[PDB]
Amino acid sequence: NTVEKVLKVKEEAEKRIAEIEKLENIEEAVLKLLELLDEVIHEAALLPITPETKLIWWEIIEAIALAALHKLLDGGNIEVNILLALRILEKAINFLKMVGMVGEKEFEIAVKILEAALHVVLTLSRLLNELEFVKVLVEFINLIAKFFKVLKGEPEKKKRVLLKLLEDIKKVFELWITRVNPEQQILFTELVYSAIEDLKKHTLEVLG
Amino acid sequence: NTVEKVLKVKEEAEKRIAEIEKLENIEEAVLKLLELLDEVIHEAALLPITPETKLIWWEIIEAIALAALHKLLDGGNIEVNILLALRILEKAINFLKMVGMVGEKEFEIAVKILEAALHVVLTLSRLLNELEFVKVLVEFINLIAKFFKVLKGEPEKKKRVLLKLLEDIKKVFELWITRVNPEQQILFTELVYSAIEDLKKHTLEVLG
Amino acid sequence: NTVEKVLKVKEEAEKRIAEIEKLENIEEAVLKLLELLDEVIHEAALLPITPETKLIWWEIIEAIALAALHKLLDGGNIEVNILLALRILEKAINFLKMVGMVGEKEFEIAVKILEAALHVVLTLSRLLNELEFVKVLVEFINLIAKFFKVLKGEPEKKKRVLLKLLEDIKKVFELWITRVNPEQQILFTELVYSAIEDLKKHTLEVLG
Amino acid sequence: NTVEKVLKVKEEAEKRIAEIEKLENIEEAVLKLLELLDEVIHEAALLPITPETKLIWWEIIEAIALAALHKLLDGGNIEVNILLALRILEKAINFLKMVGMVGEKEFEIAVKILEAALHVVLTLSRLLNELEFVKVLVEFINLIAKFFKVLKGEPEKKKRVLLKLLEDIKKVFELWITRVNPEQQILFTELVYSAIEDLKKHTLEVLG
Amino acid sequence: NTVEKVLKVKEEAEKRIAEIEKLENIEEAVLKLLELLDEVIHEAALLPITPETKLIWWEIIEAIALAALHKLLDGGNIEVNILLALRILEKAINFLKMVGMVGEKEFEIAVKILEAALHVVLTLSRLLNELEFVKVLVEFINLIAKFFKVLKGEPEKKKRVLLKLLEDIKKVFELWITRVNPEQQILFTELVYSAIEDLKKHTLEVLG
Ligand SMILES: [Zn+2]
Ligand SMILES: [Zn+2]
Ligand SMILES: [Zn+2]
Ligand SMILES: [Zn+2]
Ligand SMILES: [Zn+2]
Ligand SMILES: [Zn+2]
Ligand SMILES: [Zn+2]
Ligand SMILES: [Zn+2]
Ligand SMILES: [Zn+2]
Ligand SMILES: [Zn+2]
């Protein structure tokens, strides 16, 4: 049966997650987690999707992704780690496209993954240069736009989630901007606020 | 009749624009929009131009170009996006050459395209390095000189448009220069101001 | 009986695979595996195909091909190894042609062989020059088009497999393109995206 | 017998240490000490480890490491010296991995090396910029996590050592933070306290 | 007697080594040393091997190989020198094959030759381009796999030697990777780490 295959995949994935967790070397652990995500998504693509297996696939993806993000917080190069976080998010979005329609549980899981990735990215970007920080900010805003355009749901819930993410981003940016001299302050504030407003317009038209 | 052909081209172009707008991947969307612009210009070159069809052709070009520029604001690599904006402007200038004489409506449309490209370029160049920023500035000033050399119109209107563009450039540059140490400040100020003065001279002699 | 002959061939092939695995020199090992594959295909052509023997033939082909691909990862010249991987894929496609109609198990085996070849090719192509890398990419996209044109199955499964392969290719290409200067970036991006869209068109029309 | 070989190695290492101490140029001395450490570790890996030779190997490694760290305090480029301290610590951790089980004396020696490296790193990082200082802090916290993950011992002793190291780090950080403006203060305090809490969690789970 | 012949070979080999050492031109000296190695191996193949003569043959091979490697460090073309180091290693491996069973002294000599070749290769590859450096790394990892597959010994000693070699390679690679932009960083890290994991799997299966 298909469900039996999915739970076998889940068991093997948890075993591999424990094995990687016992690897004592963070740089070679995140790559193994990414390869595990790739294998899981390949297996998911092999078999046809059904409502009962969607939740199990989402739990597998959520476990692997959260483990990988926390490992990204545990040492390495900052820019490489930010790139890896964005790539994990992109793989999640591709799986979202493949799985099609989602329910409330899948919506919650996807929002959890997005929120964890956002927190990791903000924590890591606190240590970048000015141009790199603002570039990472703009890139993540565009990624949020893509994620909300692919993911479907009731407009009110998506609006609330978007507001929460924007408040997180704004808090970090308003703390960070005080170090960049009053003219670069104006430049970066205009750029970031325009990006946020364009994001709001895009997702609000998506809601309609 | 030529007019029905041009309106059919317009209908097809709007249909393709909607299709591209629903493509969820920005990097593949700008390239498709540029390809659509190329096909539209090839069709325009195929049939001979008349006063009635000029306006319709300009609306098609305006729609495609504005969509492409806004998509350029929506994610990608900064330098590639700036190059693509300059490419869209150059295609518009080549179409202006092909058309020949331009009236008031066509002048207004072309000025709008130029202003949109300038705003996109400034917004994106805010995130570049020093040398790359100044190189982009000089390149866009030269592009403005070429655009005003090709385009014909009343000297006072062109003077007002040129002054507005120069004020935009000067505002962005005067905000940006405060971050580059007082000697590089003198170097870049000399270079940029000389470029602007040469642009003024060239366009004022173009007025004739 | 025919089935007895097929299992005799299978046993001989496994014995030869073990012998080659104990050969300690990779360049001679891949060629010996290719010769074994040729012998197996000749034997398959000699006997008439039946539904029960199709699975056994596919298992033999799968074992030999996966062993040869993993050996291709284990040392040699990069370009020769890429060519050998493509040759193994082409031999599998020719066997697919000779066999004809396939079930779900044969579909899974063929997709697994294709994915193993794709991963080997991407890994080996990371070390090529710009032009060679893009040439290998385009050649493999055309090979994927041929493979999907020859292989028959339900449109949804083929669409999912194609999407997964395209995501893999886009992953590697988007990591690689950041080293080739913002103008070659535009050139290669246009070329590769046009190739991918043409592949999508061909495959989707094949599905219908 | 292995033992007399190990004391030969010890005699040669001490002779080379004296020779390097008489070299009057600090940049060439740290590199020579690192080469000597590499040679000693190669010799150690050559022969199989025994309980009696473990102590002698640890005394040799402790002598070389302490000499190299003190030489790192005696002049050079700050960032290169911090990097070299981290690499000495990483070599000690790799030797910990190779040896395996560690007794009380080896535990004391390893903690001595770790504490010396920490004090050197804090002293040198006192002269860095804000971003570089906080990056070095986070890197060393992750290195402490790796060191405690590899090294085994009674939970209470490891807890006490961890508390001592954290008090050292916190004292230096609380002195340093008063110079970075009240908003960057909040940013860096959040980041550093989160890193310390993660370190505590990881180590305490390792103890269990 | 055979032993007398072997010591005659040794005496003339040392005489030739001194003559070559007095040659003042390194390019002609490495080729002469390689020719001397070829002559020695031909002589060794001429007479049948015995337990007593194996050690003497290994001392001759070790002397010639170490002299040739150090000369490779003393000037020439970087790529040609790396190739020549690999050829010296391959000749040593072929001699290992022809000799057969290996004791502890021969194991020690072979490991020393391998380590000398590895250090020469790392030192010379420090000055290559990105693609050439990674290609040399992958080639040497495959050569290490071949060497450990041909050479026989107790699993623990081979495991320790392999771990030391991997730490050497990782040290050089982690110093080098910081210059290649964060996306090529991910690409090369995935490639190299996968190669190292495959090497570990291969030799650990060989140990069993
Ligand atoms: Zn952690
Ligand atoms: Zn939040
Ligand atoms: Zn937008
Ligand atoms: Zn304006
Ligand atoms: Zn292998
Ligand atoms: Zn894949
Ligand atoms: Zn001192
Ligand atoms: Zn202390
Ligand atoms: Zn020399
Ligand atoms: Zn070494």
Residue E93, number of CB atoms within 10 A of its CB: 20
Handedness of CA A123, A124, A128, A133 (dihedral sign): negative
Which among A145, A184, A191 has CB closest to B123? A191
Handedness of CA D22, D28, D33, D38 (dihedral sign): negative
- Long-range Cβ contacts of C14-22 (<8 Å, 24+ apart): C14/C63, C17/C63, C17/C64, C17/C67, C20/C67, C21/C67
Nearest to C167 by CA among E20, B25, E124: B25
- Is any Cβ of chain D less than 8 angstroms from the Cβ of A24? yes
Q: Cα distance from C157 to chain A (closest Cα, Å)?
A: 7
Give chain C's radius of gyration (CA, Å): 18
Which among E182, E190, E193 has CB closest to A83? E182
**Neighbour-count burial for B76-107, b at 16+ CB within 10 Å, e otherwise:** bbbbbbbbbbbbbbebbbebbeebeebeeebb
**Touch test B–D: 3 Cβ pairs or more under 8 Å:** no
Residue C121, number of CB atoms within 10 A of its CB: 24
Measured between alpha carbons, how far is residue A120 from residues A5, A61, A67, A73 in Å? 33, 17, 12, 7
User: Cβ distance C203 to C162 under 8 Å?
Assistant: yes
Q: How far is Cα B89 from Cα B113, in angstroms, rounded to an integer?
A: 8
Q: How far is Cα A122 from Cα E113, in angstroms, rounded to an integer?
A: 49
User: Cβ distance D180 to D122 under 8 Å?
Assistant: no
Q: Is D47 left (phi over 0), alpha (psi -120 to 50) or beta?
A: beta
Which helix (H) or strand (E) segment holds residue C119: the answer is helix C104-125
User: CA-nearest residue of chain E to A33?
Assistant: E190
Q: How far is Cα D33 from Cα D31, in angstroms, rounded to an integer?
A: 5
Handedness of CA B166, B169, B174, B177 (dihedral sign): negative
**Neighbour-count burial for A162-182, b at 16+ CB within 10 Å, e otherwise:** beebeeebeebbebbbeebee
Q: Structure tokens of A89?
A: 């998010």
User: Cβ distance E187 to D114 under 8 Å?
Assistant: no
User: Cβ distance B98 to B58 under 8 Å?
Assistant: no
Nearest to B116 by CA among B178, B58, B72, B51: B72
Q: How far is Cα C101 from Cα C152, in angstroms, rounded to an integer?
A: 7
Listed resolution, Å: 2.8
Length of chain C: 208
Burial (CB < 10 A; 0-12, 13-18, 19+), residue A134, is buried
User: Cβ distance A56 to A10 under 8 Å?
Assistant: yes
Distance B13 CA to ligand 2 centre (A): 42
Return phi, psi of residue D153, to 5°: 180, 180
User: Cβ distance C27 to C76 under 8 Å?
Assistant: yes
What DSSP string runs through B145-188? HHHHHH----HHHHHHHHHHHHHHHHHHHHHHGGGS-HHHHHHH
Q: How far is Cα B27 from Cα C189, in angstroms, rounded to an integer?
A: 9
Q: How far is Cα B127 from Cα B79, in angstroms, rounded to an integer?
A: 10
Query: C100 by DSSP, 3-state: which?
Result: coil
Which of B24, B27, B33, B128 to probe by mutation at the C interface, max C CB count within 10 Å?
Answer: B27
Which among B24, B73, B176 has CB closest to A187? B176
Which among B24, B126, B128 has CB closest to A146? B24
Q: How far is Cα E135 from Cα C75, in angstroms, rounded to an integer?
A: 10
Q: How far is Cα C196 from Cα A95, in angstroms, rounded to an integer?
A: 20
Q: Please count the helices (runs of H) and the strands (runs of E) in chain D.
A: 8, 0
**Cβ distance of E193 and A83 shorter than 8 Å:** no
In A147-203, the DSSP E strands lie at none
Nearest to B60 by CA among B85, B74, B39, B82: B39
Return phi, psi of residue A17, to 5°: -65, -45
Q: Which residue has the tokens 């050292």?
A: D168
Q: How far is Cα E18 from Cα D164, in angstroms, rounded to an integer?
A: 59
Helix, strand, coil shares of chain C, percent, nearest 5, are 85, 0, 15
Residue A18, number of CB atoms within 10 A of its CB: 10
If you ran DSSP here, which 8-state letter would residue B179 be given? G
Cα torsion for E170, E174, E175, E181, to the nearest 10°? 150
Residues of E with Cβ-Cβ distance to C24 under 8 angstroms:
146, 149-150
- Is any Cβ of chain E less than 8 angstroms from the Cβ of C194? no
Contacts of C36 (CB under 8 A, 6+ apart): C13, C16, C17, C20, C64
Give the per-residue SS3 of D13-61. HHHHHHHHHCCCCHHHHHHHHHHHHHHHHHHHHHCCCCHHHHHHHHHHH
Q: Which residue has the tokens 């049939």?
A: B47
User: Cβ distance C186 to B80 under 8 Å?
Assistant: yes
- Is any Cβ of chain C less than 8 angstroms from the Cβ of E204? no
Measured between alpha carbons, how far is residue E149 from residues C24, D75, E145, E195 in Å? 7, 47, 6, 16
Cα torsion for D71, D74, D75, D80, to the nearest 10°? 40
- Is any Cβ of chain E less than 8 angstroms from the Cβ of D110? no
First to last CA, chain A: 40
